[PDB]
Design a protein around this ligand. Structure first.
Ligand SMILES: O=c1ccn([C@@H]2O[C@H](COP(=O)(O)OP(=O)(O)O)[C@@H](O)[C@H]2O)c(=O)[nH]1
Ligand SMILES: [Cl-]
Length: 458
């Protein structure tokens, strides 16, 4: 009998991608039926394409469950990021999850961290076990879990403390103040209110899945499994299930024509647009590096809005001058496919977590260029694990300062010129493939989670 697992993602590819890979892992790999309760329409078109493809490729085990949004008035959070606004619109629709869950006869609910504080109560009154899929690193899970106690300890009669400094996560390490997600400095920020509420409820859920592997983050994973992080001393089981594997266009025809390990692939993720002054230094750094490069560019946060002319954003001269030696697009690329290709030798990445798991699975060295949110925490893991290297001094969003074309070009040449870089990254690939293979720590963790789902048949 196939356990029924209901999966409840939030908005953006960073939250949807790992849910689509989990669904396939649970269905093909462990004999589960999976219902993915996703909101329609999606903020980005890339989410729509991924959902459409998921429900074909992984049918009949994986199925769509329609989840309608109550109307939400965005006037409440003026100037908020569109994905954060969809996070909140979806959180206030959690009512509707109750009926859906009764109808699905779920063995278990797996909810996005983003939605955990509102999904867990609904699961409890419908009698369904409720697990959280944390979508970023174990280091960031350890931050999310400790941040409420941090804020509490720094609360002093006569106020609720504003700002964040160095965060000494028990039994893990120190997050320097400058690596704290920018939004967390404001306890009233839309993201922060969600992040704090979701961290508070984590002690009271049935377990937490993380798309990482023990050898990648041994200290963070060891602290989460002992419960160091909560001082109360009680934490749910943590299942390390990653790096989860993925489920011919002009850029691929180009790429296959290039020599092995020759191409610098460049992308800052699905929801970041680099300001133009920094964009020009990156263009000229790539040019000056002398390396072949494949560069994905965004002018807006949401792909649907992106109308800018590539020529108009970078330079019509630049584009003609790098013809042939390089490939530059403002459209979507199937990055999972690029990162498996033998012709890629370097990934300049914003250190979004799903991007890092992809470079980890395939052993691709990472030039870390974090921009916001969790990305400086994740960049320190890049450096720490030997997946790549990270110049801590490069500025990120909200800081003044510009990484120059010389800095880019020199760091690109060093990464590809120093063989230890490719070798360290390949050792991460080796450990990642082992983790998800039969005898690996991630395969076993996933087997244990599926066993829990089997024991919940009603
Ligand atoms: O042009 C693009 C940009 C992104 N991605 C994928 O989108 C996800 C981005 O998620 P991540 O957590 O790295 O960052 P976010 O976009 O949430 O900042 C990853 O699976 C990438 O492989 C892609 O396939 N093509
Ligand atoms: Cl660690």
């Amino acid at each position: 009998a196939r356990p029924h697992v209901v999966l409840l993602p939030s908005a953006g590819m960073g939250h949807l991608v790992p849910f689509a890979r989990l669904a396939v892992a649970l269905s093909e790999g462990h004999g589960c039926n999976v219902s993915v309760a996703a909101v329609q329409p999606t903020v980005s078109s890339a989410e729509s394409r991924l959902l459409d493809a998921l429900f074909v490729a992984a049918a009949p085990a994986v199925r769509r469950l329609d989840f309608r949004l109550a109307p939400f008035d965005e006037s409440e959070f003026p100037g908020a990021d569109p994905f954060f606004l969809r996070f909140e619109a979806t959180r206030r629709s959690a009512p509707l999850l109750g009926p859906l869950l009764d109808a699905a006869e779920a063995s278990a609910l797996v909810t996005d961290i983003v939605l955990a504080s509102v999904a867990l109560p609904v699961a409890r009154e419908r009698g369904v076990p409720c697990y959280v899929l944390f979508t970023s690193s174990a280091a960031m899970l350890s931050l999310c879990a400790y941040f409420p106690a941090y804020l509490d300890a720094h609360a002093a009669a006569g106020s609720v403390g504003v700002g964040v400094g160095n965060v000494d996560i028990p039994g893990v390490f120190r997050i320097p103040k400058s690596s704290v997600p920018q939004a967390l400095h404001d306890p009233d920020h839309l993201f922060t209110q969600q992040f704090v509420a979701n961290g508070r409820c984590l002690v009271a859920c049935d377990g937490i899945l993380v798309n990482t592997f023990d050898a990648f983050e041994p200290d963070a994973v060891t602290a989460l499994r002992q419960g160091s992080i909560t001082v109360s001393g009680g934490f749910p089981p943590v299942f390390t299930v990653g790096p989860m594997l993925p489920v011919t266009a002009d850029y691929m025809r180009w790429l296959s024509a290039q020599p092995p390990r020759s191409v610098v692939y460049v992308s800052f993720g699905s929801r970041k647009a680099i300001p133009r002054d920094q964009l020009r230094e990156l263009a000229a750094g790539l040019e000056a590096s002398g390396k072949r490069f494949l560069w994905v560019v965004k002018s807006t946060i949401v792909d649907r809005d992106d109308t800018a002319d590539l020529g108009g954003l970078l330079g019509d001269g630049f584009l003609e001058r790098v013809q042939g030696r390089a490939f530059v697009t403002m459209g979507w690329v199937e990055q999972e496919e690029i990162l498996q290709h033998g012709s890629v030798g370097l990934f300049i990445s914003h250190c979004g977590w799903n991007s890092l798991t992809e470079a980890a699975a395939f052993g691709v060295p990472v030039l870390a260029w974090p921009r916001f949110g969790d990305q400086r925490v994740n960049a320190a893991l890049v450096a720490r694990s030997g997946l790549g290297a990270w110049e801590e001094g490069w500025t990120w969003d909200g800081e003044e300062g510009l990484t120059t074309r010389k800095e880019v070009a020199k760091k690109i040449k060093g990464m590809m010129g120093y063989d230890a870089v490719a070798e360290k990254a390949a050792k991460v690939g080796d450990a990642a493939a082992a983790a998800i293979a039969k005898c690996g720590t991630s395969y076993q963790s996933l087997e244990e989670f599926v066993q829990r789902c089997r024991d919940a048949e009603r």
